Symmetry: D2
Subunit: 134 residues, 4 copies
Protein backbone atom coordinates (compact mmCIF):
# COMPACT_ATOMS: atom_id res chain seq x y z
CA UNK A 1 0.00 0.00 0.00
CA UNK A 2 1.08 3.57 -0.74
CA UNK A 3 0.24 6.43 1.63
CA UNK A 4 0.63 10.07 0.62
CA UNK A 5 -0.01 13.04 2.87
CA UNK A 6 -2.47 15.75 1.80
CA UNK A 7 -1.27 18.92 3.49
CA UNK A 8 -4.21 20.58 5.26
CA UNK A 9 -6.66 17.77 4.44
CA UNK A 10 -9.85 18.16 2.42
CA UNK A 11 -11.96 21.32 1.92
CA UNK A 12 -14.70 22.27 -0.58
CA UNK A 13 -13.00 23.17 -3.85
CA UNK A 14 -9.99 20.94 -3.15
CA UNK A 15 -8.97 18.54 -5.94
CA UNK A 16 -6.87 15.36 -5.59
CA UNK A 17 -5.10 14.25 -8.77
CA UNK A 18 -3.91 10.68 -9.29
CA UNK A 19 -2.41 9.60 -12.59
CA UNK A 20 -1.06 6.16 -13.33
CA UNK A 21 -0.83 3.25 -15.70
CA UNK A 22 -3.00 0.16 -15.22
CA UNK A 23 -1.04 -3.17 -15.14
CA UNK A 24 -1.21 -5.49 -18.20
CA UNK A 25 -3.26 -8.26 -16.41
CA UNK A 26 -5.02 -6.44 -13.58
CA UNK A 27 -7.33 -7.94 -10.99
CA UNK A 28 -8.07 -4.77 -8.97
CA UNK A 29 -6.76 -1.56 -7.48
CA UNK A 30 -8.00 0.83 -4.81
CA UNK A 31 -7.69 4.58 -4.14
CA UNK A 32 -8.86 5.79 -0.74
CA UNK A 33 -8.96 9.07 1.17
CA UNK A 34 -8.41 8.40 4.84
CA UNK A 35 -7.99 10.20 8.16
CA UNK A 36 -4.31 9.69 8.96
CA UNK A 37 -2.22 6.82 7.57
CA UNK A 38 -2.61 4.25 10.37
CA UNK A 39 -2.78 0.64 9.19
CA UNK A 40 -2.91 -1.12 12.56
CA UNK A 41 -5.58 -0.53 13.03
CA UNK A 42 -6.55 0.85 9.62
CA UNK A 43 -7.36 4.57 9.51
CA UNK A 44 -10.96 5.73 9.11
CA UNK A 45 -11.82 5.74 5.40
CA UNK A 46 -13.88 8.66 4.03
CA UNK A 47 -14.03 7.13 0.53
CA UNK A 48 -12.51 3.94 -0.92
CA UNK A 49 -12.76 3.47 -4.68
CA UNK A 50 -12.02 -0.10 -5.73
CA UNK A 51 -11.77 -0.88 -9.47
CA UNK A 52 -12.46 -4.56 -10.15
CA UNK A 53 -11.43 -5.73 -13.62
CA UNK A 54 -13.09 -9.20 -13.84
CA UNK A 55 -16.67 -7.85 -13.66
CA UNK A 56 -15.80 -4.20 -14.45
CA UNK A 57 -17.02 -2.57 -11.26
CA UNK A 58 -16.25 0.67 -9.41
CA UNK A 59 -17.12 -0.07 -5.83
CA UNK A 60 -17.25 2.78 -3.31
CA UNK A 61 -17.52 2.63 0.46
CA UNK A 62 -16.37 4.16 3.75
CA UNK A 63 -15.04 2.65 7.00
CA UNK A 64 -15.65 4.23 10.40
CA UNK A 65 -14.10 2.57 13.45
CA UNK A 66 -13.77 -0.74 11.58
CA UNK A 67 -17.36 -0.63 10.35
CA UNK A 68 -18.01 -0.70 6.62
CA UNK A 69 -20.86 1.46 5.24
CA UNK A 70 -23.23 1.05 2.26
CA UNK A 71 -21.38 -0.17 -0.84
CA UNK A 72 -22.22 1.93 -3.89
CA UNK A 73 -21.67 0.73 -7.47
CA UNK A 74 -23.77 2.69 -9.99
CA UNK A 75 -21.68 3.51 -13.07
CA UNK A 76 -22.20 4.82 -16.59
CA UNK A 77 -19.35 2.55 -17.85
CA UNK A 78 -16.10 1.05 -16.50
CA UNK A 79 -13.42 3.55 -17.33
CA UNK A 80 -10.13 1.66 -16.89
CA UNK A 81 -8.19 -0.26 -19.55
CA UNK A 82 -5.34 -2.78 -18.92
CA UNK A 83 -1.92 -1.35 -19.78
CA UNK A 84 -3.38 2.17 -20.30
CA UNK A 85 -2.71 5.47 -18.53
CA UNK A 86 -5.52 7.01 -16.45
CA UNK A 87 -6.27 10.28 -14.68
CA UNK A 88 -8.45 10.22 -11.57
CA UNK A 89 -9.56 13.54 -10.08
CA UNK A 90 -11.33 13.52 -6.75
CA UNK A 91 -13.05 16.85 -6.18
CA UNK A 92 -14.17 17.73 -2.67
CA UNK A 93 -17.38 19.74 -2.60
CA UNK A 94 -19.49 20.72 0.43
CA UNK A 95 -21.97 17.77 0.28
CA UNK A 96 -19.96 15.16 -1.65
CA UNK A 97 -16.88 14.02 -3.51
CA UNK A 98 -17.22 14.20 -7.30
CA UNK A 99 -14.99 11.64 -9.06
CA UNK A 100 -13.66 12.15 -12.60
CA UNK A 101 -11.76 9.71 -14.77
CA UNK A 102 -9.94 10.97 -17.87
CA UNK A 103 -11.89 14.22 -17.55
CA UNK A 104 -15.33 12.58 -17.40
CA UNK A 105 -17.61 12.54 -14.34
CA UNK A 106 -18.15 8.95 -13.19
CA UNK A 107 -19.95 9.22 -9.84
CA UNK A 108 -20.59 11.24 -6.72
CA UNK A 109 -20.01 10.03 -3.16
CA UNK A 110 -21.91 11.89 -0.42
CA UNK A 111 -19.96 12.51 2.79
CA UNK A 112 -20.22 10.01 5.66
CA UNK A 113 -17.19 11.45 7.39
CA UNK A 114 -18.20 15.06 8.07
CA UNK A 115 -14.88 16.37 9.40
CA UNK A 116 -13.22 17.12 6.04
CA UNK A 117 -9.91 18.62 7.27
CA UNK A 118 -9.16 15.32 9.07
CA UNK A 119 -9.15 13.58 5.64
CA UNK A 120 -5.43 14.07 5.00
CA UNK A 121 -4.14 10.85 3.44
CA UNK A 122 -4.40 9.15 0.07
CA UNK A 123 -3.90 5.38 0.08
CA UNK A 124 -3.25 3.46 -3.12
CA UNK A 125 -2.82 -0.29 -3.56
CA UNK A 126 -3.16 -2.96 -6.26
CA UNK A 127 -2.52 -3.53 -9.95
CA UNK A 128 -1.27 -0.19 -11.17
CA UNK A 129 1.78 2.07 -11.28
CA UNK A 130 1.34 5.64 -10.01
CA UNK A 131 2.95 8.31 -12.18
CA UNK A 132 1.57 11.48 -10.58
CA UNK A 133 0.04 12.76 -7.37
CA UNK A 134 -1.16 16.38 -7.07
CA UNK B 1 -42.48 -14.06 -16.05
CA UNK B 2 -42.69 -15.50 -19.56
CA UNK B 3 -42.16 -19.26 -19.94
CA UNK B 4 -41.54 -20.75 -23.42
CA UNK B 5 -41.14 -24.42 -24.32
CA UNK B 6 -37.99 -25.68 -26.07
CA UNK B 7 -39.09 -28.88 -27.84
CA UNK B 8 -36.65 -31.74 -27.11
CA UNK B 9 -34.63 -29.68 -24.62
CA UNK B 10 -30.95 -28.87 -24.99
CA UNK B 11 -28.08 -30.83 -26.62
CA UNK B 12 -24.56 -29.93 -27.84
CA UNK B 13 -24.86 -27.82 -30.97
CA UNK B 14 -28.34 -26.49 -30.14
CA UNK B 15 -28.79 -22.71 -30.11
CA UNK B 16 -31.55 -20.68 -28.41
CA UNK B 17 -32.38 -17.30 -29.95
CA UNK B 18 -33.91 -14.42 -27.98
CA UNK B 19 -34.54 -11.04 -29.63
CA UNK B 20 -36.13 -8.09 -27.86
CA UNK B 21 -36.05 -4.41 -26.95
CA UNK B 22 -34.72 -3.17 -23.60
CA UNK B 23 -37.13 -0.76 -21.81
CA UNK B 24 -36.32 2.98 -21.82
CA UNK B 25 -35.60 3.19 -18.07
CA UNK B 26 -34.53 -0.34 -17.14
CA UNK B 27 -33.71 -1.60 -13.92
CA UNK B 28 -32.91 -5.43 -14.60
CA UNK B 29 -34.04 -8.40 -16.66
CA UNK B 30 -33.38 -12.10 -16.57
CA UNK B 31 -33.30 -14.89 -19.16
CA UNK B 32 -33.10 -18.43 -17.80
CA UNK B 33 -33.08 -21.95 -19.16
CA UNK B 34 -34.93 -24.28 -16.84
CA UNK B 35 -36.10 -27.89 -16.45
CA UNK B 36 -39.87 -27.47 -16.92
CA UNK B 37 -41.93 -24.35 -16.12
CA UNK B 38 -42.94 -24.87 -12.46
CA UNK B 39 -43.00 -21.60 -10.50
CA UNK B 40 -44.32 -22.85 -7.17
CA UNK B 41 -42.05 -24.26 -6.32
CA UNK B 42 -39.66 -23.00 -8.94
CA UNK B 43 -38.20 -25.20 -11.68
CA UNK B 44 -34.50 -26.20 -11.58
CA UNK B 45 -32.46 -23.49 -13.32
CA UNK B 46 -29.56 -24.63 -15.54
CA UNK B 47 -28.57 -21.03 -16.28
CA UNK B 48 -29.98 -17.66 -15.23
CA UNK B 49 -28.58 -14.54 -16.86
CA UNK B 50 -29.52 -11.35 -15.00
CA UNK B 51 -28.63 -8.00 -16.60
CA UNK B 52 -28.43 -5.25 -13.98
CA UNK B 53 -28.36 -1.73 -15.37
CA UNK B 54 -27.32 0.51 -12.43
CA UNK B 55 -23.86 -1.08 -12.15
CA UNK B 56 -23.83 -2.79 -15.57
CA UNK B 57 -23.51 -6.39 -14.47
CA UNK B 58 -24.28 -9.67 -16.16
CA UNK B 59 -24.81 -12.09 -13.32
CA UNK B 60 -25.06 -15.85 -13.97
CA UNK B 61 -26.18 -18.61 -11.63
CA UNK B 62 -27.99 -21.98 -11.40
CA UNK B 63 -30.58 -23.37 -8.99
CA UNK B 64 -31.00 -27.05 -8.08
CA UNK B 65 -33.68 -28.11 -5.57
CA UNK B 66 -33.87 -24.49 -4.40
CA UNK B 67 -30.12 -24.19 -3.88
CA UNK B 68 -28.31 -21.46 -5.80
CA UNK B 69 -24.75 -22.19 -6.95
CA UNK B 70 -21.78 -19.81 -7.31
CA UNK B 71 -22.73 -16.59 -9.00
CA UNK B 72 -20.50 -15.62 -11.92
CA UNK B 73 -20.04 -12.05 -13.20
CA UNK B 74 -16.91 -11.85 -15.40
CA UNK B 75 -17.61 -9.69 -18.50
CA UNK B 76 -15.58 -7.96 -21.28
CA UNK B 77 -18.19 -5.15 -21.25
CA UNK B 78 -21.90 -4.60 -20.57
CA UNK B 79 -23.72 -5.20 -23.91
CA UNK B 80 -27.26 -3.76 -23.35
CA UNK B 81 -28.56 -0.23 -24.09
CA UNK B 82 -31.85 1.20 -22.76
CA UNK B 83 -34.50 1.37 -25.51
CA UNK B 84 -32.34 -0.59 -27.95
CA UNK B 85 -33.02 -3.88 -29.77
CA UNK B 86 -30.85 -6.85 -28.73
CA UNK B 87 -30.07 -10.36 -29.99
CA UNK B 88 -29.14 -13.00 -27.40
CA UNK B 89 -27.94 -16.44 -28.53
CA UNK B 90 -27.38 -19.18 -26.00
CA UNK B 91 -25.31 -21.90 -27.68
CA UNK B 92 -25.23 -25.25 -25.85
CA UNK B 93 -21.83 -26.92 -26.27
CA UNK B 94 -20.72 -30.17 -24.66
CA UNK B 95 -19.10 -28.67 -21.49
CA UNK B 96 -20.79 -25.25 -21.36
CA UNK B 97 -23.21 -22.66 -22.66
CA UNK B 98 -21.51 -19.98 -24.74
CA UNK B 99 -23.55 -16.74 -24.70
CA UNK B 100 -23.55 -14.18 -27.52
CA UNK B 101 -25.09 -10.73 -27.53
CA UNK B 102 -25.51 -8.96 -30.88
CA UNK B 103 -23.17 -11.48 -32.50
CA UNK B 104 -20.41 -11.11 -29.88
CA UNK B 105 -19.22 -13.70 -27.34
CA UNK B 106 -19.85 -12.43 -23.77
CA UNK B 107 -19.23 -15.45 -21.50
CA UNK B 108 -19.18 -19.22 -20.98
CA UNK B 109 -21.13 -20.94 -18.23
CA UNK B 110 -20.04 -24.54 -17.57
CA UNK B 111 -22.83 -27.10 -17.15
CA UNK B 112 -23.96 -27.69 -13.58
CA UNK B 113 -27.19 -29.45 -14.52
CA UNK B 114 -25.84 -32.45 -16.51
CA UNK B 115 -29.10 -33.75 -18.02
CA UNK B 116 -29.29 -31.37 -21.00
CA UNK B 117 -32.41 -32.75 -22.70
CA UNK B 118 -34.44 -31.93 -19.57
CA UNK B 119 -33.56 -28.21 -20.07
CA UNK B 120 -36.74 -27.56 -22.06
CA UNK B 121 -37.93 -24.12 -20.89
CA UNK B 122 -36.90 -20.52 -21.35
CA UNK B 123 -38.03 -18.08 -18.61
CA UNK B 124 -37.93 -14.33 -19.23
CA UNK B 125 -38.85 -11.51 -16.84
CA UNK B 126 -38.08 -7.84 -16.24
CA UNK B 127 -37.47 -4.62 -18.14
CA UNK B 128 -37.66 -5.63 -21.76
CA UNK B 129 -40.15 -6.69 -24.40
CA UNK B 130 -39.54 -9.90 -26.39
CA UNK B 131 -39.95 -9.74 -30.15
CA UNK B 132 -38.69 -13.22 -31.16
CA UNK B 133 -37.99 -16.64 -29.77
CA UNK B 134 -36.25 -19.32 -31.88
CA UNK C 1 -47.56 -13.55 0.94
CA UNK C 2 -49.79 -12.27 3.75
CA UNK C 3 -50.21 -8.56 4.45
CA UNK C 4 -51.78 -7.11 7.60
CA UNK C 5 -52.71 -3.51 8.40
CA UNK C 6 -51.19 -1.69 11.39
CA UNK C 7 -53.78 0.99 12.25
CA UNK C 8 -52.04 4.35 12.58
CA UNK C 9 -48.61 3.08 11.59
CA UNK C 10 -45.51 3.14 13.78
CA UNK C 11 -44.38 5.54 16.56
CA UNK C 12 -41.84 5.34 19.40
CA UNK C 13 -43.04 2.87 22.00
CA UNK C 14 -45.20 0.90 19.55
CA UNK C 15 -44.58 -2.88 19.39
CA UNK C 16 -45.56 -5.31 16.63
CA UNK C 17 -46.15 -8.88 17.80
CA UNK C 18 -45.75 -11.81 15.42
CA UNK C 19 -46.22 -15.36 16.72
CA UNK C 20 -45.97 -18.45 14.55
CA UNK C 21 -44.56 -21.93 14.01
CA UNK C 22 -41.53 -22.62 11.83
CA UNK C 23 -42.11 -25.36 9.22
CA UNK C 24 -40.58 -28.80 9.75
CA UNK C 25 -38.08 -28.40 6.84
CA UNK C 26 -37.54 -24.62 6.42
CA UNK C 27 -35.40 -22.79 3.90
CA UNK C 28 -36.29 -19.19 4.82
CA UNK C 29 -39.02 -16.78 5.91
CA UNK C 30 -39.40 -13.03 5.99
CA UNK C 31 -41.23 -10.47 8.12
CA UNK C 32 -41.33 -6.90 6.83
CA UNK C 33 -42.81 -3.56 7.89
CA UNK C 34 -43.80 -1.58 4.83
CA UNK C 35 -45.46 1.67 3.72
CA UNK C 36 -48.82 0.51 2.30
CA UNK C 37 -49.40 -2.95 0.83
CA UNK C 38 -48.71 -2.43 -2.89
CA UNK C 39 -47.02 -5.49 -4.43
CA UNK C 40 -46.58 -4.44 -8.04
CA UNK C 41 -44.76 -2.35 -7.70
CA UNK C 42 -43.74 -3.31 -4.19
CA UNK C 43 -44.41 -0.98 -1.24
CA UNK C 44 -41.41 0.86 0.34
CA UNK C 45 -39.85 -1.41 3.00
CA UNK C 46 -38.82 0.17 6.34
CA UNK C 47 -37.37 -3.15 7.55
CA UNK C 48 -37.25 -6.66 6.13
CA UNK C 49 -36.05 -9.45 8.38
CA UNK C 50 -35.15 -12.58 6.46
CA UNK C 51 -34.28 -15.76 8.44
CA UNK C 52 -32.10 -18.14 6.39
CA UNK C 53 -31.87 -21.64 7.85
CA UNK C 54 -29.00 -23.32 5.93
CA UNK C 55 -26.24 -20.96 7.20
CA UNK C 56 -28.34 -19.61 10.10
CA UNK C 57 -28.54 -15.92 9.19
CA UNK C 58 -30.79 -13.04 10.11
CA UNK C 59 -30.51 -10.63 7.20
CA UNK C 60 -32.00 -7.12 7.48
CA UNK C 61 -32.56 -4.55 4.77
CA UNK C 62 -34.83 -1.76 3.53
CA UNK C 63 -36.21 -0.84 0.10
CA UNK C 64 -37.01 2.70 -1.01
CA UNK C 65 -38.40 3.27 -4.52
CA UNK C 66 -37.29 -0.22 -5.58
CA UNK C 67 -33.78 0.44 -4.26
CA UNK C 68 -32.34 -1.85 -1.58
CA UNK C 69 -29.99 -0.42 1.05
CA UNK C 70 -27.13 -2.05 2.93
CA UNK C 71 -27.87 -5.52 4.21
CA UNK C 72 -27.12 -6.09 7.87
CA UNK C 73 -26.37 -9.48 9.39
CA UNK C 74 -24.76 -9.08 12.84
CA UNK C 75 -26.24 -11.60 15.31
CA UNK C 76 -25.47 -13.04 18.78
CA UNK C 77 -27.02 -16.37 17.65
CA UNK C 78 -29.66 -17.77 15.32
CA UNK C 79 -32.81 -18.01 17.19
CA UNK C 80 -35.23 -20.09 15.10
CA UNK C 81 -35.86 -23.85 15.28
CA UNK C 82 -37.61 -25.97 12.59
CA UNK C 83 -41.13 -27.00 13.68
CA UNK C 84 -40.85 -24.76 16.75
CA UNK C 85 -43.16 -21.94 17.84
CA UNK C 86 -41.65 -18.44 18.00
CA UNK C 87 -42.50 -14.93 19.15
CA UNK C 88 -41.07 -11.95 17.27
CA UNK C 89 -41.52 -8.49 18.82
CA UNK C 90 -40.52 -5.44 16.81
CA UNK C 91 -40.21 -2.43 19.12
CA UNK C 92 -40.15 0.91 17.35
CA UNK C 93 -37.90 3.29 19.28
CA UNK C 94 -37.01 6.87 18.42
CA UNK C 95 -33.77 6.02 16.53
CA UNK C 96 -34.32 2.35 15.59
CA UNK C 97 -36.33 -0.85 15.65
CA UNK C 98 -35.25 -3.18 18.44
CA UNK C 99 -36.03 -6.79 17.55
CA UNK C 100 -36.76 -9.53 20.10
CA UNK C 101 -37.21 -13.25 19.49
CA UNK C 102 -38.71 -15.29 22.34
CA UNK C 103 -38.10 -12.40 24.76
CA UNK C 104 -34.40 -11.98 23.90
CA UNK C 105 -32.97 -8.94 22.15
CA UNK C 106 -31.51 -9.98 18.78
CA UNK C 107 -30.57 -6.85 16.85
CA UNK C 108 -31.22 -3.16 16.33
CA UNK C 109 -32.03 -1.65 12.96
CA UNK C 110 -31.70 2.13 12.62
CA UNK C 111 -34.45 4.00 10.76
CA UNK C 112 -33.91 4.58 7.08
CA UNK C 113 -37.55 5.47 6.39
CA UNK C 114 -38.12 8.42 8.78
CA UNK C 115 -41.88 8.86 8.25
CA UNK C 116 -42.84 6.31 10.88
CA UNK C 117 -46.64 6.79 10.80
CA UNK C 118 -46.50 5.81 7.10
CA UNK C 119 -45.18 2.34 8.14
CA UNK C 120 -48.61 0.73 8.48
CA UNK C 121 -48.25 -2.77 6.94
CA UNK C 122 -46.72 -6.05 8.00
CA UNK C 123 -45.80 -8.47 5.19
CA UNK C 124 -45.07 -12.14 5.91
CA UNK C 125 -43.90 -14.85 3.52
CA UNK C 126 -42.05 -18.18 3.49
CA UNK C 127 -41.55 -21.30 5.55
CA UNK C 128 -43.74 -20.69 8.58
CA UNK C 129 -47.34 -20.62 9.81
CA UNK C 130 -48.55 -17.44 11.52
CA UNK C 131 -50.68 -18.00 14.60
CA UNK C 132 -50.93 -14.45 15.98
CA UNK C 133 -50.54 -10.83 14.97
CA UNK C 134 -50.83 -7.93 17.42
CA UNK D 1 -0.01 -15.87 8.18
CA UNK D 2 1.48 -18.81 10.00
CA UNK D 3 2.52 -21.66 7.72
CA UNK D 4 3.37 -25.14 9.00
CA UNK D 5 4.60 -28.10 6.94
CA UNK D 6 2.55 -31.30 6.93
CA UNK D 7 5.15 -34.00 6.22
CA UNK D 8 4.01 -36.32 3.40
CA UNK D 9 0.82 -34.32 2.79
CA UNK D 10 -2.75 -35.56 3.12
CA UNK D 11 -4.11 -39.05 2.64
CA UNK D 12 -7.31 -40.83 3.76
CA UNK D 13 -7.32 -41.38 7.53
CA UNK D 14 -4.88 -38.51 8.20
CA UNK D 15 -6.03 -35.96 10.82
CA UNK D 16 -4.81 -32.35 11.23
CA UNK D 17 -5.16 -30.97 14.76
CA UNK D 18 -5.31 -27.21 15.48
CA UNK D 19 -5.84 -25.87 18.96
CA UNK D 20 -5.89 -22.23 19.94
CA UNK D 21 -7.67 -19.47 21.82
CA UNK D 22 -9.93 -16.96 20.13
CA UNK D 23 -8.97 -13.33 20.78
CA UNK D 24 -11.16 -11.23 23.11
CA UNK D 25 -12.67 -9.07 20.34
CA UNK D 26 -12.42 -11.17 17.19
CA UNK D 27 -13.45 -10.20 13.69
CA UNK D 28 -12.35 -13.34 11.78
CA UNK D 29 -9.77 -16.06 11.42
CA UNK D 30 -8.90 -18.56 8.69
CA UNK D 31 -7.39 -22.07 8.66
CA UNK D 32 -6.37 -23.39 5.24
CA UNK D 33 -4.76 -26.51 3.83
CA UNK D 34 -2.66 -25.62 0.81
CA UNK D 35 -0.22 -27.10 -1.74
CA UNK D 36 3.14 -25.68 -0.66
CA UNK D 37 3.44 -22.42 1.27
CA UNK D 38 3.93 -19.92 -1.57
CA UNK D 39 2.41 -16.50 -0.89
CA UNK D 40 3.64 -14.70 -4.02
CA UNK D 41 1.90 -16.09 -5.74
CA UNK D 42 -0.40 -17.78 -3.28
CA UNK D 43 -0.39 -21.59 -3.10
CA UNK D 44 -3.41 -23.53 -4.31
CA UNK D 45 -5.91 -23.90 -1.49
CA UNK D 46 -7.59 -27.28 -1.05
CA UNK D 47 -9.78 -25.96 1.78
CA UNK D 48 -10.02 -22.58 3.52
CA UNK D 49 -12.19 -22.37 6.60
CA UNK D 50 -12.95 -18.78 7.55
CA UNK D 51 -14.78 -18.05 10.82
CA UNK D 52 -16.59 -14.70 10.80
CA UNK D 53 -17.76 -13.50 14.21
CA UNK D 54 -20.12 -10.60 13.41
CA UNK D 55 -22.74 -12.83 11.69
CA UNK D 56 -21.39 -16.17 12.92
CA UNK D 57 -20.42 -17.87 9.67
CA UNK D 58 -18.11 -20.75 8.79
CA UNK D 59 -17.31 -20.08 5.21
CA UNK D 60 -15.48 -22.73 3.14
CA UNK D 61 -13.87 -22.47 -0.26
CA UNK D 62 -10.90 -23.44 -2.43
CA UNK D 63 -8.53 -21.57 -4.72
CA UNK D 64 -7.03 -23.13 -7.82
CA UNK D 65 -4.70 -20.95 -9.92
CA UNK D 66 -6.06 -17.82 -8.21
CA UNK D 67 -9.66 -18.77 -8.96
CA UNK D 68 -11.89 -19.17 -5.91
CA UNK D 69 -14.57 -21.88 -6.28
CA UNK D 70 -18.09 -22.12 -4.76
CA UNK D 71 -18.36 -20.73 -1.23
CA UNK D 72 -20.07 -23.14 1.15
CA UNK D 73 -21.66 -21.92 4.37
CA UNK D 74 -24.16 -24.50 5.76
CA UNK D 75 -23.77 -24.96 9.52
CA UNK D 76 -25.61 -26.60 12.46
CA UNK D 77 -24.37 -23.69 14.62
CA UNK D 78 -21.35 -21.38 15.01
CA UNK D 79 -18.87 -23.16 17.32
CA UNK D 80 -16.32 -20.43 18.29
CA UNK D 81 -16.38 -18.08 21.34
CA UNK D 82 -14.28 -14.90 21.94
CA UNK D 83 -11.48 -15.45 24.45
CA UNK D 84 -12.13 -19.21 24.59
CA UNK D 85 -9.94 -22.18 23.65
CA UNK D 86 -10.95 -24.35 20.68
CA UNK D 87 -10.02 -27.69 19.12
CA UNK D 88 -10.26 -28.02 15.33
CA UNK D 89 -9.77 -31.42 13.70
CA UNK D 90 -9.63 -31.72 9.91
CA UNK D 91 -10.05 -35.40 9.00
CA UNK D 92 -9.02 -36.31 5.48
CA UNK D 93 -11.20 -39.07 4.09
CA UNK D 94 -11.26 -40.47 0.56
CA UNK D 95 -14.10 -38.25 -0.83
CA UNK D 96 -13.98 -35.27 1.57
CA UNK D 97 -12.51 -33.41 4.51
CA UNK D 98 -14.60 -33.80 7.67
CA UNK D 99 -14.15 -30.90 10.11
CA UNK D 100 -14.77 -31.26 13.87
CA UNK D 101 -14.80 -28.44 16.43
CA UNK D 102 -14.51 -29.34 20.14
CA UNK D 103 -15.26 -33.00 19.27
CA UNK D 104 -18.38 -32.21 17.25
CA UNK D 105 -18.81 -32.70 13.51
CA UNK D 106 -19.55 -29.35 11.88
CA UNK D 107 -19.37 -29.87 8.11
CA UNK D 108 -17.95 -31.90 5.23
CA UNK D 109 -16.03 -30.42 2.29
CA UNK D 110 -15.80 -32.62 -0.83
CA UNK D 111 -12.39 -32.63 -2.51
CA UNK D 112 -11.80 -30.12 -5.30
CA UNK D 113 -8.05 -30.65 -5.27
CA UNK D 114 -7.78 -34.39 -6.03
CA UNK D 115 -4.03 -34.83 -5.55
CA UNK D 116 -4.07 -35.30 -1.78
CA UNK D 117 -0.36 -35.86 -1.07
CA UNK D 118 0.33 -32.43 -2.63
CA UNK D 119 -1.69 -30.77 0.20
CA UNK D 120 1.19 -30.41 2.67
CA UNK D 121 0.82 -27.00 4.28
CA UNK D 122 -1.42 -25.45 6.91
CA UNK D 123 -1.90 -21.70 6.80
CA UNK D 124 -3.41 -19.86 9.77
CA UNK D 125 -4.20 -16.17 10.11
CA UNK D 126 -6.45 -13.74 11.98
CA UNK D 127 -7.85 -13.05 15.43
CA UNK D 128 -6.62 -16.07 17.39
CA UNK D 129 -3.50 -17.45 19.02
CA UNK D 130 -2.42 -20.98 18.16
CA UNK D 131 -1.44 -23.31 20.98
CA UNK D 132 -1.10 -26.67 19.18
CA UNK D 133 -0.52 -28.13 15.71
CA UNK D 134 -0.42 -31.96 15.36
Amino acid sequence: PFCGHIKGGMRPGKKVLVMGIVDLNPESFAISLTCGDSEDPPADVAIELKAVFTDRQLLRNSCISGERGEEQSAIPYFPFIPDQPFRVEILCEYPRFRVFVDGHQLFDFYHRIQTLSAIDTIKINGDLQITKLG
